[model samples]
Target: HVGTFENITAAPADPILGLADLFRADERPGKINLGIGVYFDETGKCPVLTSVKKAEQYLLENETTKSYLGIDGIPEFGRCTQELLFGKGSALINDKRARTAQTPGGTGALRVAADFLAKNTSVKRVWVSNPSWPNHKSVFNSAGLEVREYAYYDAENHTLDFDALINSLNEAQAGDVVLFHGCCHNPTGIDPTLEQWQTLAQLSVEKGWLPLFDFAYQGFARGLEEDAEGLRAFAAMHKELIVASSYSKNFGLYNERVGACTLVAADSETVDRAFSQMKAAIRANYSNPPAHGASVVATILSNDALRAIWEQELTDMRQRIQRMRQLFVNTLQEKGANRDFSFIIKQNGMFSFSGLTKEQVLRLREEFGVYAVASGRVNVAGMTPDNMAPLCEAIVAVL
Candidate 1:
């Protein structure tokens, strides 16, 4: 059986997802799942936004062909997505230096970029934050690139290690891919200031390294335009910038498999060539991306009425998360948490790395029935009014 099978083996479960499985098996009704990166409202519900529903209704009313979008995927979606991510009327957009190809999601975008990097550049080392999205390393490794970690979050200060990050980037070679969370950094919600971002852009210019942005939470962080500041700054500073954006978190379209991979080349010629290569890679991989989600995003961004509605929904989500974050920090302070958790209010987006240790996390789970990633990352959006008190109590007890 061993020889017959293709080296059959049972791989260990994913740490985050495995915890979800355990939580699900438990009979505890009050169990909270903070391990997932998804956004949940104060009601502990993931609402499919009214805008998305309206867009779908319009599509149903005016249906046409159910045809496959070729290698490059939907042309309209690509154009709209490119403009949405990079500001509209950008020279990069007009000159065609910025090109987007539809992918399964942010993960697919990373894969496409990885394949491109593996083929085009001589750079071997891919740099990521010390405690980045776990998939960053996994994706890079699968693409035959060596992964390296750079200092990012400072657990003691509960903030970014700006100096260490800059120093780490200084040692990176030219053409190496430096992955950054475009906004609302995962695991730790900590983000650097605009000045720090500018410094990194200047460093990338001086060092001649590639800047690849992975933006999983866009509209959920703040306003869409506001959240895209870093990515826009990077693109404005450098020509060779790669950005991977997903609708999973922002649109609440996780299973719909919708996302875009874009690259801004140094010039029009480079962009043309890169576009061809990206298409080739995508064709060989998933043929062409699914059409439904692309249609949803396109319809939402293009239509005037729908776009306004979508913006309202996004604003609601963003404001609600901010409220939850503020309340959590306040509760922690009230409980006399020795360490200053006021930093939590400052950190943006869905996740907050509460600096809880493994032992503390275990106690929270076994005794309190609250679920969170083992690395102390909790989805702040998962907290509801009903459980907020208990969560505060649990955290206070652990602290």
Candidate 2:
């Protein structure tokens, strides 16, 4: 009877990660992989920041014991991360209306938020951007919450469909959870302007909907503070919201898996109660988050010098991606691809939805050895000086 397990079948492989596997197996010397969302340096490597190295050195020298962290993880990490997202002297923090708990990563934070909402609130549906990160629907669904889509990207224009988005939100009932990318929206990389953000805040308030922000790429699109404009705008107008923040991209701690799930409630009592639920979710899921990544992040955030270094490094990475975006457009034009690629420059963050069709994407991989998502979302950080010209040639060839 125990052998009845033989009836279990194989599950579908993760799309993004599956692409990576295919990319790695290719033996072509000129292969270019732009599928995964990772920050690659000029040399096509993910560099550890000087700040992280220093923090690790310090920890290595002084750390005493390997012990278990609380269900909420490191307190300093939670406090520092909260300050980073909400800003120092934020009214929410001052009023004791905000709380944070460390999680394994942004994915874990989203899971925690989903589980907490499903268990605590009356909210049943989570409205995600139509072309959001492919995992958003699965994560919310796994928590027994219904997943709905709201209009977001204008694929034809390579821009945000603001009117359609607003119209969809207007139809949402009260108590629904609407997920917003805090900045640097994944896949499309098309973020709503500050004015649009203001309108969204007002609409959410008017509709009595809860905003759940996914803050995975806080500093990737622009400066740290500048990228937070949308989130801050929402906080200014509302008393309660959810944020799932990741240190993986900004701090280059992808493997370490450091992140936080935060909630700003209507009052101290509400926030306290929310914190308890969040903690319970974490306990049930992972027990507690790892300490090393949180410690490194906290060290850098707390130390003025290291914080400056980390900021500069992050800025350099952002600028590099922007430069690549510019070069991608220029090269395509210079090659006389017979199409306007200027839209690539307008998209932010590490991705550019290149508007390539599934057939074109397949042709790109088969003929040019350039792997991009079927939807044409390419990691801008994957572009490098050595391969820029060839990549442009390949793209033009496919077109």
Top candidate by lDDT:
2
How do the residues 251-292 of candidate 1 rate in per-residue lDDT, one tens digit apiece? 788888899999888898988887898888888888899888
The per-model lDDT (C-alpha) reads 0.85, 0.90
Model 1, runs deviating above 4 Å: 1-9
How good is model 1 by TM-score?
0.96
lDDT of 2 by residue, 140-217 (tens): 999999999999988889899999998876678899999999998988899999999999999889988899999999
Question: Whose TM-score is greatest here?
Answer: 2
lDDT of 1 at 349: 87
Give candidate 2 misplaced runs (Cα > 4 Å).
Answer: none
- Clashing pairs in model 2? none
